[PDB]
Design a protein around this ligand. Structure first.
Ligand SMILES: O=c1c(O)c(-c2ccc(O)c(O)c2)oc2cc(O)cc(O)c12
Length: 274
């Protein structure tokens, strides 16, 4: 699939950089024709078939295909795609309140945690309903619309590892951030929607305590901890956290993906359900 090959600069002006990573940079931008504002993600293309630099066309096209399917208040939306020799440029919905990660570093109560979590669960319910696994859920990939409100609204971003799961599972080169990946990722096993639910358990633990449940001193330690389900609720952090909140986490941080709560289970769980 090919994208718009006119110069993006003829249609958009860029401004503040919103973030950067491995082979991508995200810039605030404004469409010249409408004055409307967006986030432009510049993704570096591979220059040869065997290069390890840049993102493969196959991987770029998958991400764009997934983004085009999505329309839900809790997930980022895609406006347009451009490309040139060096980059694919995604013109994405602008979200200005920063990462949930940075909002967290600034300070949650169970109410504040569930307020965020319900939105995340709603977005993931939408995705999983469409058989889309995100595969990279973490606080860095949850953005706030406006961070100066008591209960900020959120949108899930970064579908770079996302996959359609038409056959119950996928087994591919898929591996996210060690702190948040499920044991089946660590062990290179077939992956399905269940992996996202584990990641939600990790996010929930962090929301409530400020601490990361499997984090070791090195990446290999973290991964070893994940595979062994080596976590516990520290009393210093969880002493005034409800047993029901702990129950919710405990039913997500389960090694056997078949025994893990599904997204539907999570919405019916007594900590979440009205
Ligand atoms: O940092 C951002 C980011 O990474 C992405 C993003 C979204 C979907 C993807 O599939 C993807 O690869 C990246 O969107 C954004 C949108 C914003 O308004 C602001 C941002 O800072 C980001």
């Amino acid at each position: 699939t090919v994208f718009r090959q006119e110069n993006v600069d003829d249609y958009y002006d860029t401004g503040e950089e919103l973030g950067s990573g491995q082979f991508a940079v995200v810039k605030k931008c404004r469409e010249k024709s409408t004055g409307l504002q967006y986030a432009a993600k510049f993704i570096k293309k591979r220059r040869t078939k065997s290069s390890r630099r840049g993102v493969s066309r196959e991987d770029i096209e998958r991400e764009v295909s997934i983004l085009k399917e999505i329309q839900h208040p809790n997930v980022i939306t895609l406006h347009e795609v451009y490309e040139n020799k060096t980059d694919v440029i995604l013109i994405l919905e602008l979200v200005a309140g920063g990462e949930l990660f940075d909002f967290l570093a600034e300070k949650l109560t169970e109410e504040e945690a569930t307020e965020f979590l319900k939105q995340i669960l709603n977005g993931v319910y939408y995705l999983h309903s469409l058989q889309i696994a995100h595969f990279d859920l973490k606080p860095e990939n949850i953005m706030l619309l406006d961070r100066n409100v008591p209960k900020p609204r959120i949108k899930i971003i970064d579908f770079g590892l996302a996959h359609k799961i038409d056959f119950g599972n996928e087994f591919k080169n898929i591996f996210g951030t060690p702190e948040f990946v499920a044991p089946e990722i660590v062990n290179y096993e077939p992956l399905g929607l269940e992996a996202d639910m584990w990641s939600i358990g990790v996010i929930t633990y962090i929301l409530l305590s400020g601490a990361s449940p499997f984090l070791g001193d090195t990446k290999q330690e973290t991964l070893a901890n994940v595979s062994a389900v080596n976590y516990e609720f520290e009393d210093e952090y969880f002493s005034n956290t409800s047993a029901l909140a702990k129950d919710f986490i405990r039913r997500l941080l389960v090694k056997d993906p078949k025994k893990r709560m599904t997204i539907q289970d999570s919405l019916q769980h007594p900590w979440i359900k009205p």
